[PDB]
Design a binder for this molecule. Structure first.
Ligand SMILES: Cc1cn([C@H]2C[C@H](N=[N+]=[N-])[C@@H](COP(=O)(O)O)O2)c(=O)[nH]c1=O
Ligand SMILES: Cc1cn([C@H]2C[C@H](N=[N+]=[N-])[C@@H](COP(=O)(O)O)O2)c(=O)[nH]c1=O
Ligand SMILES: Cc1cn([C@H]2C[C@H](N=[N+]=[N-])[C@@H](COP(=O)(O)O)O2)c(=O)[nH]c1=O
Lengths: 190, 200
């Protein structure tokens, strides 16, 4: 089973990944995780990060260029993902293909049913061969709550996410809070 | 030996690569050739091509983004360029790192002393560790003649007549200062044998 954990930055994804992993193991299943972007593991991911820090000229000014960088990063992890999927019962990804769909649309002031989100599916899932996640778990957080733990882009990204999940973008979604009961979540995703 | 053929679009590089390839084979030197972008062999390349034809939203509008896809295309070809360099006496590349430096600077109305050229330098050679070619051969040609060759669809770069002229100008500067290594500037009527003899 392939599970993607999605949400805005500061939503609490890294932590929810561990908890959900802990719950699945307690239930007698093996679990491997992988996080994106794979900083330090792929040039695409490292250039994207740098671009976001004001490097590489006008690269960051292009929504589709940034999106492509994050996709090329995932493309280079296909062999890894396929490996984890053959060895472990559950593979949990800290951010996946929907992160590109959500942030790209938000930067373009589009919505989940827009072109950028449609484009992400055609590119990553079919052309690059990234496995479509069985479950996409949205750790939804309001703009207000996120602030506590780029606001406008972040807020709009949160909105695209809420809609992506409601529309079953790329598959079945589940919305949860950071406090969600690990054991109940694992049982629901079994 | 690694030789890179450079020039603007329609300059007639493809041909020169064939002719030079022959001269080398005649002189008893096995030759292999590779062209960039490696269409059909690199998703970065394929996407770059489609982006110049108006696809992938605002991709092509970023000078550095396009340069990056090409740089990433070549990076994923490092092992191959080395595999060729080992199995043949001469490797000929149809466009290489310099293409990226000339076009990127041209798109920015910059010259060889600009940031784009230096940026290309660091990321491709230094960071990505692309093998520096022993020879960079600039195939100079008339801007009028080159443009007509292409008019006879064309992507956003080919339709840009001023881009192609600035690209030629920057190219000449690159070769003139030995950007990235030793260059050789030739005309369309250059004799293959003579050139091959010179290069090797
Ligand atoms: C260490 C830790 C940080 N956080 C916070 C710090 C961040 N704000 C946020 C990290 O969110 P992301 O994992 O999606 O980057 O959660 C938790 O919610 N739980 C934790 O156990
Ligand atoms: C993995 C991923 C991240 N991103 C974004 C969200 C983030 N924006 N900020 N700041 C940025 C870095 O995300 P991380 O903080 O999780 O590394 O890139 C995408 O746009 N698409 C993707 O596929
Ligand atoms: C290989 C390459 C092509 N290009 C450009 C020139 C062209 N416009 C376009 C395609 O060139 P070719 O037609 O030679 O494939 O991309 C660069 O700007 N940098 C590069 O490194």
């Amino acid at each position: 089973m392939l599970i993607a954990i999605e949400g805005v930055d500061g939503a609490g994804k890294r932590t929810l990944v561990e908890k959900l992993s802990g719950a699945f193991r307690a239930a007698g299943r093996s679990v491997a995780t992988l996080a994106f972007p794979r900083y330090g593991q792929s040039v695409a991911a490292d250039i994207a990060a740098e671009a976001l820090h004001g490097e590489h000229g006008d690269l960051a000014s292009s929504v589709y260029a940034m999106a492509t960088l994050f996709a090329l990063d995932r493309a280079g992890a296909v062999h890894t993902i396929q490996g984890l999927c053959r060895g472990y019962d559950v593979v949990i990804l800290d951010r996946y293909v929907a992160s590109n769909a959500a942030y790209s649309a938000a930067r373009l002031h589009e919505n989940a049913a827009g072109k950028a989100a449609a484009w992400v599916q055609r590119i990553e899932f079919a052309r690059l061969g990234l496995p479509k996640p069985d479950w996409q778990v949205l750790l939804a957080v309001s703009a207000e709550l996120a602030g506590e733990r780029d606001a406008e882009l972040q807020q709009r990204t949160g909105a695209v996410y809420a809609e992506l999940a409601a529309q079953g973008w790329g598959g079945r979604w589940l919305v949860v809070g950071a406090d969600v009961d690990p054991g109940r979540l694992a049982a629901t995703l079994a």
